[PDB]
Amino acid sequence: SPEALQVRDAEDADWPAILPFFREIVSAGETYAYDPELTDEQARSLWMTPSGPQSRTTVAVDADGTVLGSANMYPNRPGPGAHVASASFMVAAAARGRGVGRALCQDMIDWAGREGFRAIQFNAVVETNTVAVKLWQSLGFRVIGTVPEAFHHPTHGYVGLHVMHRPL
Amino acid sequence: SPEALQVRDAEDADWPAILPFFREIVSAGETYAYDPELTDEQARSLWMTPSGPQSRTTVAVDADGTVLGSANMYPNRPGPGAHVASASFMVAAAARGRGVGRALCQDMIDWAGREGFRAIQFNAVVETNTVAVKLWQSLGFRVIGTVPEAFHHPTHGYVGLHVMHRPL
């Protein structure tokens, strides 16, 4: 339920529940471009946020504490680009249609605002991932442009990658 | 001269000549967003291409073998995005206006073609860097879109970052 769902900072102990989401996403090959052969520990380094720039990892949990999804958020570029945040999202297949993506992204937008960022950018949103596209649009993001044929989809062939942006 | 200029694979021994270019670019803060405090060896790891995916680092040299500039080139994204190449360029301040950027980029386009890439993408081209923008346009790249106010320029304030693309 919406009432049972919480987005909170990820704890180190949540990583084993997040890892299979990552593996599902690489296997499906429909939403994000990753190296297919990362170690568990390489994936953890990319996803979990170590203490010490303006970065965070969250989990969405149900009322039993079961992890349903996760987000991480960080400056999109360093130095003179660091005022623009970005983020990535993973939702458990079993948890789709429960508003988990929306909750994670809204929480991320609230975080970016309070942390002083001026905007949020998603560098590559697969154009066939229309659930994500439409969800991000509903949360204020727009397509800046689309790089054509930039992603090989297993069913739809070479498809575009949107760059999406939201001011804060 | 054009005749004296060669683009060739970088040798390990060229790195000390390339390092100051990197430092100049970070210091000026006008063209690329980098962490300002990378070690020399972190910069080398980011720039020089180790053996073992579809990546290369070049130097432009004069007839005495003096390094005038450098490029590196690689897949823009892994896995299902790996058919799109990207690249970065650094030209010595003292070597500007000698066609070094053009030579490095043409060589990169020729490489990407022979290595089988389907396109080239530049993720972030500062909109005020019009020498680069116009040069890339002259070599077939177009602006896909511009992320507004994504880069803090020391004179022009918050300015856009173009995403640029060329088919192969």
CATH number at residue A161: 3.40.630.30
CA atoms of B43 and B54, how far apart (whole Å): 20
| CB < 8 Å to A38, chain B | none
Given a contact cutoff of 8 angstroms between Cβ atoms, the answer to whether B160 and B149 are in contact is: yes
Give the SS3 label for residue B70: strand
A165 touches chain B (CB under 8 A): yes
The one-letter amino acid code at B25 reads I
- Experimental method of this PDB entry: X-ray
Q: What are phi and psi of A125, to 5 degrees?
A: -115, 115
A50 touches chain B (CB under 8 A): no
Burial category of A101 from C-beta neighbours within 10 Å (exposed 0-12, middle 13-18, buried 19 and up): buried
The one-letter amino acid code at A1 reads S
d(CA B64, nearest CA chain A) in Å: 36
Given a contact cutoff of 8 angstroms between Cβ atoms, the answer to whether A155 and A31 are in contact is: no
The answer to whether A79 contacts B118, with C-beta atoms less than 8 Å apart, is: no
B159: CB partners within 8 A, 6+ apart: B126, B127, B128, B149, B150, B151, B152, B153
Q: At what angle do helices B100-114 and B130-138 cross, to 10 degrees?
A: 50
CA atoms of B152 and A42, how far apart (whole Å): 32
- Dig out the tokens for B46 from the structure: 């980011």
Q: What are phi and psi of A67, to 5 degrees?
A: -75, 125
CA atoms of B107 and B71, how far apart (whole Å): 9
Chain centroid offset of residue A79 CA: 22
Chain centroid offset of residue A138 CA: 16
Given a contact cutoff of 8 angstroms between Cβ atoms, the answer to whether A143 and A163 are in contact is: yes
Chain centroid offset of residue A21 CA: 12
Dihedral angle of Cα A4, A111, A162, B142, to the nearest 10 degrees:
180
Count the alpha carbons within 13 Å of B88 in the hemisphere toward its beta carbon.
18
Pick the closest to residue A165 from A48, A86, A65 (CA basis).
A86
Distances (CA, A) of B8 to A57, B46, B68, B108: 43, 19, 12, 11
d(CA A26, nearest CA chain B) in Å: 9
> What region does B116 belong to: left with phi over 0, alpha with psi -120 to 50, or beta?
left
Residue B131: count other Cβ atoms within 10 Å of its Cβ.
Answer: 13
Given a contact cutoff of 8 angstroms between Cβ atoms, the answer to whether A69 and A91 are in contact is: yes
Dihedral angle of Cα A75, A81, A82, A83, to the nearest 10 degrees:
-100
Domain extent for A117 = 1-168
CA atoms of B6 and B24, how far apart (whole Å): 23
Identity of the residue in A34, A80, A163 whose CB atom sits nearest the CB atom of B145: A163
| CB < 8 Å to A118, chain B | 149, 158
Give the SS3 label for residue B1: coil
Dihedral sign, CA of B71, B76, B79, B84? negative
Dihedral sign, CA of B23, B25, B30, B35? negative
CA atoms of A91 and A68, how far apart (whole Å): 6
Given a contact cutoff of 8 angstroms between Cβ atoms, the answer to whether B147 and A144 are in contact is: yes
Residues 7-46 of A with CB under 8 A from B: 26, 29, 33-36
Given a contact cutoff of 8 angstroms between Cβ atoms, the answer to whether B136 and B102 are in contact is: no
Dihedral angle of Cα A115, B162, A33, A18, to the nearest 10 degrees:
0
Helix (H) or strand (E) holding B47: helix B40-47
> What region does B6 belong to: left with phi over 0, alpha with psi -120 to 50, or beta?
beta
A82 touches chain B (CB under 8 A): yes
Measured in residues, chain A has a length of 168
How many angstroms is the resolution? 1.4
The answer to whether B145 contacts A148, with C-beta atoms less than 8 Å apart, is: no
Chain centroid offset of residue A63 CA: 22
The DSSP-derived string for A93-144 is GGGTTSSHHHHHHHHHHHHHHHTT-SEEEEEEEETT-HHHHHHHHHTT-EEE
CA atoms of B85 and B77, how far apart (whole Å): 8
Q: At what angle do helices A100-114 and A130-138 cross, to 10 degrees?
A: 50
Domain count, chain B: 1
B52 touches chain A (CB under 8 A): no
Residue B129: count other Cβ atoms within 10 Å of its Cβ.
Answer: 19
Q: At what angle do helices B40-47 and B15-28 cross, to 10 degrees?
A: 100
Given a contact cutoff of 8 angstroms between Cβ atoms, the answer to whether B91 and B67 are in contact is: no
Measured in residues, chain B has a length of 168
Locate the chain A residue with the closest alpha carbon to B84. A150
The answer to whether B33 contacts A152, with C-beta atoms less than 8 Å apart, is: no
Q: Pinpoint the alpha helices (H) of B115-168.
A: 130-138
B118 touches chain A (CB under 8 A): yes
Given a contact cutoff of 8 angstroms between Cβ atoms, the answer to whether B10 and B65 are in contact is: no
Q: Quick one: DSSP state of residue A50?
A: P
A65: CB partners within 8 A, 6+ apart: none
Q: What are phi and psi of A138, to 5 degrees?
A: -65, -20
